[PDB]
Write a protein that holds these residues in place. Structure first.
Motif, mmCIF file in Angstrom:
data_model
loop_
_atom_site.group_PDB
_atom_site.id
_atom_site.type_symbol
_atom_site.label_atom_id
_atom_site.label_comp_id
_atom_site.label_asym_id
_atom_site.label_seq_id
_atom_site.Cartn_x
_atom_site.Cartn_y
_atom_site.Cartn_z
ATOM 1 N N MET A 97 -23.328 6.707 29.912
ATOM 2 C CA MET A 97 -23.418 7.785 28.876
ATOM 3 C C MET A 97 -24.578 8.725 29.201
ATOM 4 S SD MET A 97 -25.000 5.707 25.582
ATOM 5 C CE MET A 97 -25.605 7.174 24.748
ATOM 6 N N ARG A 98 -24.512 9.941 28.639
ATOM 7 C CA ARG A 98 -25.515 10.981 28.827
ATOM 8 C C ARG A 98 -26.843 10.548 28.208
ATOM 9 N NH1 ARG A 98 -22.593 15.788 25.082
ATOM 10 N NH2 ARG A 98 -22.156 14.403 23.317
ATOM 11 N N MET A 99 -27.939 10.855 28.915
ATOM 12 C CA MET A 99 -29.283 10.421 28.558
ATOM 13 C C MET A 99 -30.286 11.531 28.867
ATOM 14 S SD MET A 99 -29.491 6.405 29.742
ATOM 15 C CE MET A 99 -31.052 5.988 28.965
ATOM 16 N N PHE A 100 -31.427 11.495 28.166
ATOM 17 C CA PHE A 100 -32.505 12.456 28.341
ATOM 18 C C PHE A 100 -33.705 11.785 29.004
ATOM 19 C CE2 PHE A 100 -30.153 14.501 24.842
ATOM 20 C CZ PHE A 100 -30.145 15.820 25.242
ATOM 21 N N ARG A 101 -34.241 12.447 30.038
ATOM 22 C CA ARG A 101 -35.497 12.066 30.663
ATOM 23 C C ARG A 101 -36.607 12.918 30.050
ATOM 24 N NH1 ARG A 101 -35.499 9.484 35.761
ATOM 25 N NH2 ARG A 101 -33.669 10.674 36.439
ATOM 26 N N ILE A 102 -37.390 12.300 29.158
ATOM 27 C CA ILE A 102 -38.329 13.022 28.311
ATOM 28 C C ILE A 102 -39.755 12.538 28.571
ATOM 29 C CG2 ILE A 102 -36.695 13.790 26.546
ATOM 30 C CD1 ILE A 102 -38.936 10.965 25.537
ATOM 31 N N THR A 103 -40.697 13.490 28.537
ATOM 32 C CA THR A 103 -42.121 13.223 28.673
ATOM 33 C C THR A 103 -42.813 13.578 27.358
ATOM 34 O OG1 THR A 103 -41.858 13.755 31.012
ATOM 35 C CG2 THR A 103 -44.114 13.504 30.233
ATOM 36 N N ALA A 104 -43.587 12.621 26.830
ATOM 37 C CA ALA A 104 -44.261 12.764 25.547
ATOM 38 C C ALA A 104 -45.674 12.191 25.621
ATOM 39 C CB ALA A 104 -43.451 12.094 24.463
ATOM 40 N N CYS A 105 -46.595 12.838 24.894
ATOM 41 C CA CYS A 105 -47.976 12.398 24.775
ATOM 42 C C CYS A 105 -48.305 12.172 23.301
ATOM 43 C CB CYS A 105 -48.927 13.419 25.392
ATOM 44 S SG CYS A 105 -50.625 12.812 25.576
ATOM 45 N N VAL A 139 -43.573 17.187 26.140
ATOM 46 C CA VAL A 139 -43.956 17.995 27.288
ATOM 47 C C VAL A 139 -42.713 18.664 27.873
ATOM 48 C CG1 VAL A 139 -45.160 18.013 29.534
ATOM 49 C CG2 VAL A 139 -45.940 16.462 27.740
ATOM 50 N N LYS A 140 -41.735 17.848 28.293
ATOM 51 C CA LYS A 140 -40.564 18.328 29.012
ATOM 52 C C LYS A 140 -39.338 17.503 28.626
ATOM 53 C CE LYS A 140 -39.975 17.899 33.666
ATOM 54 N NZ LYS A 140 -38.528 17.705 33.926
ATOM 55 N N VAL A 141 -38.224 18.208 28.379
ATOM 56 C CA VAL A 141 -36.929 17.608 28.096
ATOM 57 C C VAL A 141 -35.936 18.098 29.149
ATOM 58 C CG1 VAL A 141 -35.054 17.358 26.384
ATOM 59 C CG2 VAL A 141 -37.418 17.446 25.600
ATOM 60 N N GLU A 142 -35.248 17.144 29.791
ATOM 61 C CA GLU A 142 -34.186 17.434 30.743
ATOM 62 C C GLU A 142 -33.055 16.420 30.582
ATOM 63 O OE1 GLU A 142 -35.959 17.112 34.822
ATOM 64 O OE2 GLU A 142 -35.350 15.005 34.680
ATOM 65 N N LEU A 143 -31.815 16.912 30.713
ATOM 66 C CA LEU A 143 -30.628 16.074 30.716
ATOM 67 C C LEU A 143 -30.465 15.474 32.112
ATOM 68 C CD1 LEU A 143 -28.145 15.674 28.518
ATOM 69 C CD2 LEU A 143 -26.907 16.991 30.238
ATOM 70 N N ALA A 144 -30.830 14.192 32.232
ATOM 71 C CA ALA A 144 -30.834 13.477 33.498
ATOM 72 C C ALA A 144 -29.409 13.099 33.897
ATOM 73 C CB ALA A 144 -31.733 12.268 33.405
ATOM 74 N N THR A 145 -28.657 12.542 32.937
ATOM 75 C CA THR A 145 -27.292 12.090 33.159
ATOM 76 C C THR A 145 -26.332 12.953 32.343
ATOM 77 O OG1 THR A 145 -27.366 10.391 31.453
ATOM 78 C CG2 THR A 145 -28.083 9.711 33.629
ATOM 79 N N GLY A 146 -25.210 13.327 32.971
ATOM 80 C CA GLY A 146 -24.181 14.142 32.344
ATOM 81 C C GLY A 146 -24.349 15.626 32.656
ATOM 82 N N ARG A 147 -23.562 16.455 31.958
ATOM 83 C CA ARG A 147 -23.556 17.901 32.135
ATOM 84 C C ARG A 147 -23.358 18.590 30.784
ATOM 85 N NH1 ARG A 147 -18.570 17.611 35.373
ATOM 86 N NH2 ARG A 147 -19.892 17.408 37.228
ATOM 87 N N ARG A 181 -24.529 7.649 36.990
ATOM 88 C CA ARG A 181 -25.269 6.403 36.842
ATOM 89 C C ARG A 181 -26.127 6.113 38.073
ATOM 90 N NH1 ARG A 181 -23.697 3.367 32.027
ATOM 91 N NH2 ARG A 181 -21.730 4.213 31.224
ATOM 92 N N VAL A 182 -25.541 6.264 39.269
ATOM 93 C CA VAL A 182 -26.166 5.794 40.497
ATOM 94 C C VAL A 182 -27.093 6.870 41.061
ATOM 95 C CG1 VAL A 182 -25.808 4.487 42.642
ATOM 96 C CG2 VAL A 182 -24.012 4.503 40.910
ATOM 97 N N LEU A 183 -26.545 8.072 41.288
ATOM 98 C CA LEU A 183 -27.226 9.132 42.019
ATOM 99 C C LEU A 183 -28.234 9.860 41.127
ATOM 100 C CD1 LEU A 183 -24.038 10.283 43.905
ATOM 101 C CD2 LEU A 183 -26.145 9.633 45.086
ATOM 102 N N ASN A 184 -28.360 9.405 39.872
ATOM 103 C CA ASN A 184 -29.360 9.905 38.942
ATOM 104 C C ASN A 184 -30.711 9.272 39.269
ATOM 105 O OD1 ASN A 184 -30.520 11.049 36.316
ATOM 106 N ND2 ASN A 184 -30.573 8.854 35.882
ATOM 107 N N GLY A 185 -31.636 10.108 39.762
ATOM 108 C CA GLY A 185 -32.995 9.711 40.099
ATOM 109 C C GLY A 185 -33.031 8.578 41.120
ATOM 110 N N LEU A 186 -32.274 8.752 42.211
ATOM 111 C CA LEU A 186 -32.129 7.741 43.246
ATOM 112 C C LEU A 186 -32.822 8.206 44.525
ATOM 113 C CD1 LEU A 186 -30.516 4.964 43.273
ATOM 114 C CD2 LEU A 186 -28.840 6.184 44.661
ATOM 115 N N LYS A 187 -32.737 9.515 44.803
ATOM 116 C CA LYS A 187 -33.350 10.134 45.969
ATOM 117 C C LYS A 187 -34.871 10.126 45.819
ATOM 118 C CE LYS A 187 -31.381 12.618 49.011
ATOM 119 N NZ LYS A 187 -31.582 14.044 49.383
ATOM 120 N N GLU A 188 -35.343 10.445 44.605
ATOM 121 C CA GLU A 188 -36.762 10.565 44.294
ATOM 122 C C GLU A 188 -37.423 9.188 44.272
ATOM 123 O OE1 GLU A 188 -36.296 13.202 40.737
ATOM 124 O OE2 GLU A 188 -37.699 14.542 41.777
ATOM 125 N N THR A 189 -36.650 8.163 43.887
ATOM 126 C CA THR A 189 -37.119 6.787 43.809
ATOM 127 C C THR A 189 -37.224 6.194 45.216
ATOM 128 O OG1 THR A 189 -36.130 6.673 41.622
ATOM 129 C CG2 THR A 189 -36.798 4.578 42.572
#
Ligand SMILES: *[C@H](C)[C@H]1/C(=C/c2[nH]c(/C=C3N=C(/C=C4\NC(=O)C(CC)=C4C)C(C)=C\3CCC(=O)O)c(CCC(=O)O)c2C)NC(=O)[C@@H]1C
Ligand SMILES: *[C@H](C)[C@H]1/C(=C/c2[nH]c(/C=C3N=C(/C=C4\NC(=O)C(CC)=C4C)C(C)=C\3CCC(=O)O)c(CCC(=O)O)c2C)NC(=O)[C@@H]1C
Ligand SMILES: *[C@H](C)[C@H]1/C(=C/c2[nH]c(/C=C3N=C(/C=C4\NC(=O)C(CC)=C4C)C(C)=C\3CCC(=O)O)c(CCC(=O)O)c2C)NC(=O)[C@@H]1C
Ligand SMILES: *[C@H](C)[C@H]1/C(=C/c2[nH]c(/C=C3N=C(/C=C4\NC(=O)C(CC)=C4C)C(C)=C\3CCC(=O)O)c(CCC(=O)O)c2C)NC(=O)[C@@H]1C
Ligand SMILES: *[C@H](C)[C@H]1/C(=C/c2[nH]c(/C=C3N=C(/C=C4\NC(=O)C(CC)=C4C)C(C)=C\3CCC(=O)O)c(CCC(=O)O)c2C)NC(=O)[C@@H]1C
Ligand SMILES: *[C@H](C)[C@H]1/C(=C/c2[nH]c(/C=C3N=C(/C=C4\NC(=O)C(CC)=C4C)C(C)=C\3CCC(=O)O)c(CCC(=O)O)c2C)NC(=O)[C@@H]1C
Ligand SMILES: *[C@H](C)[C@H]1/C(=C/c2[nH]c(/C=C3N=C(/C=C4\NC(=O)C(CC)=C4C)C(C)=C\3CCC(=O)O)c(CCC(=O)O)c2C)NC(=O)[C@@H]1C
Ligand SMILES: *[C@H](C)[C@H]1/C(=C/c2[nH]c(/C=C3N=C(/C=C4\NC(=O)C(CC)=C4C)C(C)=C\3CCC(=O)O)c(CCC(=O)O)c2C)NC(=O)[C@@H]1C
Ligand SMILES: *[C@H](C)[C@H]1/C(=C/c2[nH]c(/C=C3N=C(/C=C4\NC(=O)C(CC)=C4C)C(C)=C\3CCC(=O)O)c(CCC(=O)O)c2C)NC(=O)[C@@H]1C
Lengths: 224, 161, 67, 160, 161, 160, 160, 161, 161, 160
Positions: free
Chosen positions: C1-9, C51-59, I107-115
């Motif tokens: 499923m779609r997920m967010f890679r988020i940075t927070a302080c 700090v920063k929000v990006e959609l890591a998984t999905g489109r 799932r796989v290729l998400n943050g795999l190159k950087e790791t």
């Protein structure tokens, strides 16, 4: 009385209504808070001291597990090699304890969620997310939720994730309403995303037994 | 939990008295046996799975318990009993190191009878398995330290029966 | 499923914590999509800074097949 | 006790005691005769330490003993000397255990709430143990005093 | 994190060889300096709050930082700064005892520069505060032990600035 | 190392090194030459320890070297003695460090997943290190053998 | 302020302000004019309060101003007058807001660790606020003094 | 969060001055409009859903946003946008009660812009949606209190854009 | 994740039109090829442990990668590489069953190159390992199914390239 | 899709697909031509389904078309016909996928929050799909209707 589990390390053990009738009904109303004995200092009870909710029991209660030390492969200081990275056994002991909190006992070989473990070890997810994933596991559903009465399963889950029995109706009715409409996974979500969870345990803190029932402590400390 | 040191301290604290000659001698006896306890624990730690292996073989294996109808039939329930005896041996080692059976009452024997009855676990078959542990541990560790371990393993048996 | 890679302080306001808190102060974590609204609120109410929000998984703009 | 600490840590990890933890107890067991020597020294001259540290406290802090103070009177001073006699007893339990657990469990946790309720100044009790440390240090050997000071400073540090 | 012993082990493990004579002398060199490292650690540990006391008075106190408008004005922000310098002192002691500045990278300067810029903590003032720690420590433990401490406290400064 | 482990333990509680922990490093530092001596003897006779314990293993467990087994063949027997050469190397790092972490880190963590993938009996590798202990006890003094056994038994316990 | 507390409680339950909560805000709003009058009298005589209570502290506790003490010298007494000016300012912020939050946030959190680093006794600063309370209650009307004393006792209560 | 009272306290706390005549009148102005801010929130709380009900119909509905291909076609996306606007209206009311826009910088605008950009949420459409709220909020409440709300709703618009 | 059917549905849903004949042809193509997709997946899932074992043997084992100095030397690092290729085979099966490679990105290729760059994992050694998996699978399932499986195994190779 | 639902269930347990799971995809892919036939019939006579079922809703519940109702006027009636056309489109996506996930992700998750903000009775929308099921079942063959109605009944069940 049947809804109360035995205060043991593992295994949801409940008094059966059919097997040896020992049902003791009592007219409990909505705003009825149950008096619970804190594992740590008696002053550190949240009923009288709500500020001291995230205070660790200092050799009075349960051992607190925290991701205080740096996770292996966090920074690119230890380049390529460094086979003897000392901060590796600490995070593995945390994982085992995180498994021991969700499921009272240590699991078998083909039961450990390896995907969730390595994401915590890489630093992709926090402990709060890791505990949530272990409680959202199909194994937790099979072992504790499915074979037990709905409110028995809610009560035991609250005693595992928060390390605390429910105060009364107000909390029990809340999670039971979620259990009816949304399901088991959302009950897990609600107990983790609760404010009291966040106050007691941070993003790095593994849950622990904070409060006991008077009947449970009597089983522990009224033996020979 | 409380060890032999804490038990002497607590008893003196309850009275509200300083550590007298009788209290000091109780500590000195523990420190004399301290070398025996640590060495014994290291032997049990090294052969943790080995004790449980030869405990099930003696008492449990090739019986009605293992065979269909018995409690320890399925692989799920077999690994459960292995774990149980792994827990029993480890907590006996804790009590052996401490010199007090306070940990056994607090963490093991607290509503263990009610647990085993509800599941349908045979008490007599479990006791025999802990009795099998005792004989295996005594043959491995020694005479004096094996006797010391045997006391707390009997304490588990007495609390279960 | 779609997920967010988020940075927070998130700084401490209530109590001075004698233990190492740097891991729980400034962090970059992955959060589920359904959990992000609750997570963002938690950071906001505690008195933190995203700090920063990006959609890591999905489109972006996934009508069907996001789970 | 350090034995208790090692078992609790092993209990939480649900594993047998580490060879590092086993050697930690083994070193404590062998060095138990030294701990019982310090304990007997403090027990033997308990009435000497309390009396010396008492008088030394009352000279440094006259306000607690002066009319209007918490420990004013022959019965109130006797309670204050009893208080220190309790704290010195707590130290002797700590030295024997080789750990700061028994001092914390019995006479450190909920001390701040206790002395506020009684109307006792907490810094004056912190001074009283600091005076008890000074007398005890000059009644035993340098190695004996340094080991005992570790428990004494824990009583001072928590109360301060 | 690795120490001087661990670094010798790691280096030998890279080649996959047994501990060679060159690595053998490296261990004995650490054991020769081991007496100095333990002694200095005990002095810093005893005067932990005392070192910080002199450090803040030399650099931070009676400045614009402590004055309103500054970052060290608030009593919370002051208590955080003492705590920060309590970390910088303890971890420098850890690095000195280890004989390697690997702990300062993985724990201290893991994300310290990021959080300090986020909160708005001035880098120039805190570097001077650690430089104030340097002079107080070297005056206390000695010129020999203060040289070692001075390196690690500079390593904290260089990583942060 | 024991000095590193003492730091990790102190950092977990967020406190300075204990006087007991500082003396533990001091005792290790002073007796550093005696513990390093153990590594020298194991390095000097690194061949004859592996050859003998290897031969002892093939007599104790002949099934693994028998056809159908894992160690059957000239090449498969060779890599087994190569594995025993690696495990002895782990011990030499362990007895130098003063801790069981360097043995755990390189060749003991995730070892069950490794040997399962290769199809190696984990109980037989436990017996190989057991025989390596027996040769080590024979080629060393009683005090050195008892010191080394604490590290050898750690490899045994984690294996089976 | 109670406006701050109301919004926090509302946002936690994810709801708008209840009529009972809204009644509290408007009542505080009406009583805000009276609360501003208390602040004006305290800021009007901010010099006379600090100097009198400062002197009264030096008479009660002479060891503060005596050589060897913390506040000895023309510079060190000026910092003590600054501190008492700061804590009086916190009270004036407290009476305006009608809450103990701005006192807690700015100058009443980790104060125990703050003065311990400086070496200033916490009992003496607790006395100084208590002396500041007595002057403020004397110069300014008794009905408003009882309102002001609630904020003063909060400072003393956190200090001790 | 920071309120109007708290902002006046903080502003004087930066310089380190007491509450001067300029600071006193700012408080008195807030206490004068206190009843006005309470009644305005009471009207909002009465018909909170009603504002969100018509604002979508005025701006967003029967447009390319709600049409297949838009970012408000699906029920899930629609329920998200309804939630967003409901939260936008709620936090604007909170800002109106507090008398400060510092809550808006903390409780909404703190990491929403980069969230919307990552999800491909159109910034132009959401601003138009909050603009659609603005005048109807003024119609239901009044001219004086509607202008007050009109500032905070525009503050969300300026922050997002 | 997106499969083949969901991708057709989603492409029809963005335009808002029903399933047209041109979009139906891609459905018929999946329903015809799905017979090969299920059959090959059942074979791969059967021999999942033996496929990895064979591939690691011919590619990674008895080389400089597994030798001390390499990245696949440590038992922790070895078990991690086994775990990785266990995932690589499993997720490629998922993609083969789905008929789309979006799952691999999800799932796989998400943050795999950087790791992999941060840890210092060899890119060439990983590709050769997956290429070894490709040849083992193709020899097991068949020529047509192995090529179809080999597309996703080359896609995960190119993504890590 | 039923393929995706199988994958995500298998990935949650971190395992390969079950023998039953693989058989279900095999049964879906063989009956994919039958599922395409259901779609082609529903897409062909799409306008006749929604018109009839729309009119059948308006005779059953005329309060919708009556003043005060949600769909009052010819424009709002056309919107209601469009809503049913959108839902019939979701069923056609549902039958080809072999799962109710596509229907959920677009037009089931957060529908109760939607029609609340529109002021539409959701039980009336539930009854519109009921009528849509009835006309569609009478349109095409009974063996295909039983499969079609199964996905229709879910839409009714989630709506009501
Ligand atoms: C082995 C000697 C015999 C045996 C064991 C057996 N145990 C279980 C399952 C459980 N064991 C316990 C008991 C404990 N809880 C505690 O807190 C402690 C002390 C630390 C113990 C030992 C519990 C709670 C369970 C329930 C499930 C769980 O593991 O959490 C089983 C399986 C029972 C089942 O049907 O699930 C078995 C078989 N039974 C025998 O046949 C042996 C003689
Ligand atoms: C004092 C009058 C007597 C006394 C008290 C005493 N109590 C405890 C421990 C606990 N007290 C409670 C009870 C309550 N918690 C609640 O929520 C309520 C209802 C509002 C009450 C009254 C609890 C729960 C505990 C357990 C610890 C905790 O705080 O969670 C002790 C300590 C017992 C121990 O051994 O730990 C004591 C001494 N006992 C006396 O001697 C007085 C006569
Ligand atoms: C043959 C395929 C391999 C083999 C078998 C072997 N097993 C045992 C011992 C036991 N096997 C079981 C396992 C089960 N019992 C059950 O109820 C189930 C679930 C349906 C299983 C799988 C048990 C419990 C025993 C103990 C005996 C008993 O039932 O009482 C042995 C004996 C070893 C010993 O003496 O300990 C053997 C030889 N061993 C191989 O190497 C073959 C490849
Ligand atoms: C004092 C030298 C300077 C100063 C201090 C200051 N620090 C903060 C906030 C934080 N400091 C840290 C640093 C650490 N916490 C850790 O866990 C570690 C590693 C062991 C360190 C070194 C962090 C992460 C914080 C956040 C708060 C927290 O509790 O973690 C502040 C801001 C306080 C606030 O919340 O407003 C300040 C002021 N600033 C100065 O003026 C000095 C030069
Ligand atoms: C001998 C005691 C047993 C045995 C040996 C055996 N091992 C392998 C394969 C490998 N061995 C290792 C393991 C290690 N490398 C390390 O870095 C460490 C820790 C320091 C160890 C112990 C590895 C990586 C391999 C892979 C091959 C290679 O070396 O490149 C085999 C071959 C397996 C096969 O059949 O292909 C064997 C035979 N097997 C036994 O039966 C003994 C009990
Ligand atoms: C007078 C009541 C007591 C006293 C005064 C005294 N204070 C200091 C040092 C400092 N005092 C503070 C306190 C604050 N300043 C703030 O900004 C705040 C938050 C609102 C507070 C509470 C601080 C931070 C300092 C440092 C000096 C500076 O501002 O740069 C001293 C000097 C200590 C020294 O020896 O260096 C003194 C003497 N001491 C007493 O004895 C009185 C009880
Ligand atoms: C409505 C005006 C327009 C619109 C909305 C929309 N937003 C999202 C996604 C999210 N919205 C937020 C934002 C917030 N974070 C916060 O902390 C707060 C204040 C409490 C808010 C309002 C969040 C967290 C998300 C993430 C997903 C979630 O629902 O939790 C979407 C979904 C994006 C998608 O395409 O799936 C939508 C539709 N978009 C429009 O087109 C409207 C004009
Ligand atoms: C084997 C082909 C080669 C190799 C692999 C290797 N990987 C790791 C560690 C990690 N790999 C991943 C990546 C993933 N996370 C996932 O969830 C998935 C499936 C979707 C993958 C593929 C991550 C995040 C880890 C865990 C981080 C950790 O180790 O804690 C290692 C270990 C790295 C280290 O040195 O510590 C290795 C060795 N490297 C080789 O040598 C092979 C050629
Ligand atoms: C007919 C069954 C009932 C009815 C219809 C009706 N609906 C609306 C409002 C809207 N409904 C939709 C449509 C959808 N949005 C989705 O996410 C999906 C799933 C794919 C659907 C079906 C939309 C977009 C709207 C908003 C209007 C627009 O197109 O912009 C209305 C309009 C309400 C109003 O007055 O604004 C109506 C009339 N009403 C009934 O009473 C029938 C029972």
């Amino acid at each position: 009385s049947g809804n109360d589990p035995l205060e043991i390390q593992f295994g949801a053990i409940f008094p059966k209504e059919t097997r040896n009738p020992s049902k003791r009904p009592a007219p409990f109303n909505k705003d009825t808070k149950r008096i619970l004995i804190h594992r740590g200092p008696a002053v550190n009870n949240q009923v009288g001291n709500p500020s001291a909710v995230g205070e660790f029991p200092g050799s009075l209660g349960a051992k607190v597990f925290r991701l205080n030390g740096g996770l292996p492969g966090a920074k690119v200081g230890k380049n390529t090699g460094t086979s003897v990275k000392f901060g590796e056994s600490s995070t593995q002991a945390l994982i085992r304890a995180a498994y021991r909190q969700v499921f009272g006992r240590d699991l078998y070989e083909g039961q450990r969620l390896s995907v969730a473990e390595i994401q915590l070890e890489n630093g992709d997810i926090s402990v709060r997310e890791f505990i949530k994933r272990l409680a959202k596991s199909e194994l937790f559903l099979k072992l504790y939720w499915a074979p037990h009465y709905v409110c028995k399963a809610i009560e035991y889950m609250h005693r595992r994730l928060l390390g605390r029995p429910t105060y009364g109706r107000q909390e029990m009715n809340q999670y039971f309403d979620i259990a009816s409409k949304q399901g088991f996974y959302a009950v897990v979500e609600a107990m983790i995303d609760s404010k009291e969870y966040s106050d007691a345990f941070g993003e790095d803190t593994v849950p622990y037994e904070r409060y006991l029932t008077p009947g449970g402590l009597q089983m522990r400390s009224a033996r020979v | 939990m409380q060890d032999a040191i804490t038990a002497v301290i607590n008893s003196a604290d309850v009275q509200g008295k300083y550590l007298d000659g009788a209290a000091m001698d109780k500590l000195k006896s523990y420190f004399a046996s301290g070398e025996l306890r640590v060495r014994a624990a290291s032997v049990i730690s090294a052969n943790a799975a080995t004790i449980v292996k030869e405990a099930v073989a003696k008492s449990l294996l090739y019986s009605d318990v293992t065979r269909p109808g018995g409690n320890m039939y399925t692989t799920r329930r077999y690994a459960a009993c292995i774990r149980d005896l792994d827990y029993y041996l480890r907590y006996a080692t804790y009590a052996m190191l401490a010199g007090d059976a306070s940990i056994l009452d607090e963490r093991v024997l607290n509503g263990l009878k009610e647990t085993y009855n509800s599941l349908g676990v045979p008490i007599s078959s479990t006791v025999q398995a802990i009795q099998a542990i005792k004989e295996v541990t005594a043959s491995l560790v020694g005479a004096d330290a094996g006797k010391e371990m045997g006391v707390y393993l009997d304490y588990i048996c007495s609390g279960l029966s | 499923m779609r997920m967010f890679r988020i940075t927070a302080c998130v700084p401490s306001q209530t109590r001075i914590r004698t233990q190492r808190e740097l891991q729980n102060t400034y962090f970059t974590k992955l959060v589920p999509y359904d959990n992000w609204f609750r997570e963002q609120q938690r950071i906001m109410k505690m008195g933190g800074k995203i700090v920063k929000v990006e959609l890591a998984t999905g489109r972006p703009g996934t009508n069907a097949g996001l789970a | 006790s350090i034995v208790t600490k090692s078992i609790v840590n092993a209990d939480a990890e649900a594993r047998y005691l580490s060879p590092g933890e086993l050697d930690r107890i083994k070193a404590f067991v062998t060095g138990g005769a030294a701990r019982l020597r310090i304990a007997e020294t403090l027990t033997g001259s308990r009435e000497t330490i309390v009396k010396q540290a008492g008088d030394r406290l009352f000279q440094k802090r006259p306000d607690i003993v002066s009319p209007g103070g918490n420990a004013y009177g022959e019965e109130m001073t006797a309670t204050c000397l009893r208080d220190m006699d309790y704290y010195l007893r707590l130290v002797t339990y700590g030295v024997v255990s080789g750990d700061v657990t028994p001092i914390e469990e019995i006479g450190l946790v909920g001390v701040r709430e206790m002395y506020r309720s009684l109307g006792t100044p907490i810094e004056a009790v912190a001074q009283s143990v600091r005076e008890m440390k000074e007398v005890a240090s000059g009644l035993m050997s340098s190695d004996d005093a340094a080991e005992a000071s570790a428990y004494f400073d824990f009583v001072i540090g928590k109360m301060s």
